[PDB]
Amino acid sequence: YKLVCYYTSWSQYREGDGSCFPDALDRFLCTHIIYSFANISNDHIDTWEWNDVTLYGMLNTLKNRNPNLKTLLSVGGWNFGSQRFSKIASNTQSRRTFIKSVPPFLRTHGFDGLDLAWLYPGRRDKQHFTTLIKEMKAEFIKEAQPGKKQLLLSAALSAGKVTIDSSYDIAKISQHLDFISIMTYDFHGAWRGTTGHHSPLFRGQEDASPDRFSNTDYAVGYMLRLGAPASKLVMGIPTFGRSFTLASSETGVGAPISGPGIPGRFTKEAGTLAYYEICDFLRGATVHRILGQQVPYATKGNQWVGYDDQESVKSKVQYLKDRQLAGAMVWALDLDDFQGSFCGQDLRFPLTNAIKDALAAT
């Protein structure tokens, strides 16, 4: 089973124990670690952070004691110009030079492959996307033609029905990508102005949601339906939760909200919490397991957060193995309790270790 785990470069900047560097990662924990994100410097694959070239090294020396560990470089992101991905994907010369430039970069900095993180291609850029991947795979074979171990190519694809419809030719692109990663989180299935879980496994209660689309189960099934082979499907499990400030006093799913949750001390972004911040939050909080969705939320005062714990990630890995998917994708390593200092037991990476155990178990 594949275990694809993202590391974010900007996570190096968090205060105190929140600071995460590629040397703090377990080299046996994941099968695939994806550095995010690499930039586009006018049609060339460039670096993003000043010390990227350094952290690249910091990550890839983890391959010294583990050979089967494979690393990829994610180009794109969401704070990256989407139009600055389109205008570079629609001109033939631009695509040519970028594709030619990717393999020398990946070899210079010791990456095993490339991960496409375009969030998100429009309708006007759907077809181009396809051909992009088609050519991006092609050159790779050429680069590996002189008896070299060929580079990997992956794409992180949206899990919302509208976006998959408007941007992906899943059937065609599934033959050229080594694996696809379904971002089965950040769902917005809650009633307007009400609490809801951003990563439910199933729909759960029928009349407590507008659509049966905003959940992991439907997204995985739809992906399979549109031609993606399960052998190349990696299901995303979040090591973060989405939070709200309760407006009235109710605290169940569908309770009114006055806005996003209070920011975490380290991640500092309203409406989100890292799992270790959640473990802090759990002190004095009440945990409820949403019956139909197989995932927990925690409430405490006027705060409400939907997240994943060891139990729920075990359930998600079970759903994965049933569907005979390729494995699990984790966003992201630096959001798990990587230091082990928040969720007790002095144990590092509790969520990702639960995922790996559940994958290896029988």
Added chain:
Amino acid sequence: YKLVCYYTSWSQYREGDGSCFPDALDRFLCTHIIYSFANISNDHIDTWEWNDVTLYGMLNTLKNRNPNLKTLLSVGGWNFGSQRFSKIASNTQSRRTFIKSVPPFLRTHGFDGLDLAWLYPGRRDKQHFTTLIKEMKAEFIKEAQPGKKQLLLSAALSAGKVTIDSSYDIAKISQHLDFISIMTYDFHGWRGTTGHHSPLFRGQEDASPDRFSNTDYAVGYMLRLGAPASKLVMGIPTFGRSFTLASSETGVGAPISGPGIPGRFTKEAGTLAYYEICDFLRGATVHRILGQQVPYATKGNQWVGYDDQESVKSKVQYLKDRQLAGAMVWALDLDDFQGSFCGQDLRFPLTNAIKDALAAT
């Protein structure tokens, strides 16, 4: 059969032949004409346009030479803060004041009843809605007790399953409403694609985003939920919803970049009055959607779904099969009231089609 027809006061302001006043309304066309909309101010029902009293009189004059015609005043609309209506309905004092104020107002200005057009009650408002409808119906009963012709009470209810589930207690409120007008248009059925806003049936199954975005599902659902057929009036639009096409695909589900170009008179992107559509049909190609029994028109990069005489004949046939109370029309001023744009100088071609289709056997 009831024929409920809405007149909108703001149509008085449209340019040229689009200007529509109540004296342009055929006094024999409909069985009920509802004036839209009335305001709520200081928890009293009140006028909205500066000349509402005059226009009330122009409308209620049509009863002199036609005693059988009834008129109602519609309170609400979509430019009325549902926040406000919620405050009035939940606050007991505001609610009682509004209720007490309605009958003297309707009597003073010559109306036969009230139409409730709260668009829309929230989840938290559903029960409030019921209470309102109940107590209002009681007040009328009290005001009419000494041998008076009781005021009517009606409501315009969404045809959207989600809205119906969160907002209305159909079985309770249909006990007190004299009729329910179900707004079977403006249907939201896949993003970025053309689609008919008032299809009769679901049509081709794999071309439908869902099962509930059509007239037939809404009618059957509100029947299922306890609304009697004898109290159900089915909405038929004299307008079309328009899109601007992104490609050479012109069928149902073709990609779009946004709402259609505004009409010359109605000046609202994504909508077109029926007489505007008649102007648009000149040089256009019309396709009847097989499964959905409604037409759409296309020309250049423009695509509009709407109703014509054939489709409203079919919709009337449906509602008669279902033994409903009749048809509701939004709106009189969007039909070709001048008779100039469509047909052969026939006034109200769509509404007259509906009326004749109701009259047949």
